[PDB]
Design a protein around this ligand. Structure first.
Ligand SMILES: O=C(N[C@H]1CCCNC1)c1ccccc1
Ligand SMILES: [Zn+2]
Ligand SMILES: [Zn+2]
Ligand SMILES: [Zn+2]
Ligand SMILES: [Zn+2]
Lengths: 76, 69
């Protein structure tokens, strides 16, 4: 039905919001510290000197284990 | 249709996975450091001396700003 199409769109958008803002391919699993922005996968977070969202200096990156993780890279 | 019910269940489970594992009421927005388990809201994370997933000592809590918030 049309309701099925609406729910499919909601699911798609929620899943897309969990993807890295730089490569758009890998799940977000890294936090820039101390600002807290959690918007990148490990590879894209590795070489940024400043946060791509707020421009704060990145002192270090903290890996995050989220219950929503489903990709092979985060389960293996 | 039956697919509407299946999609409602998938959406409910994904939304539930974003809720605090302790209180089940607030969105996850905190990481236990250094282990990295990100499973609580700030109020439950403040009250735990040990990670509720791996039992490692919590040295400090890092707030996380997620695009899904
Ligand atoms: O009351 C709040 N949190 C509680 C609700 C019940 C579950 N444990 C946390 C709350 C959260 C954010 C800002 C202000 C108040
Ligand atoms: Zn990436
Ligand atoms: Zn930032
Ligand atoms: Zn909580
Ligand atoms: Zn832990």
């Amino acid at each position: 039905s049309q309701q099925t199409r609406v729910l499919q769109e909601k699911l798609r958008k929620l899943k897309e919001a969990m993807l890295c803002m730089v490569c758009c391919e890998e799940e977000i699993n890294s936090t820039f510290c101390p600002c807290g922005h959690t918007v990148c996968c490990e590879s894209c977070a590795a070489q940024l000197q400043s946060c791509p969202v707020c421009r704060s200096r990145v002192e270090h990156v903290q890996h995050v284990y989220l219950p929503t993780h489903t990709s092979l890279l985060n389960l293996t």
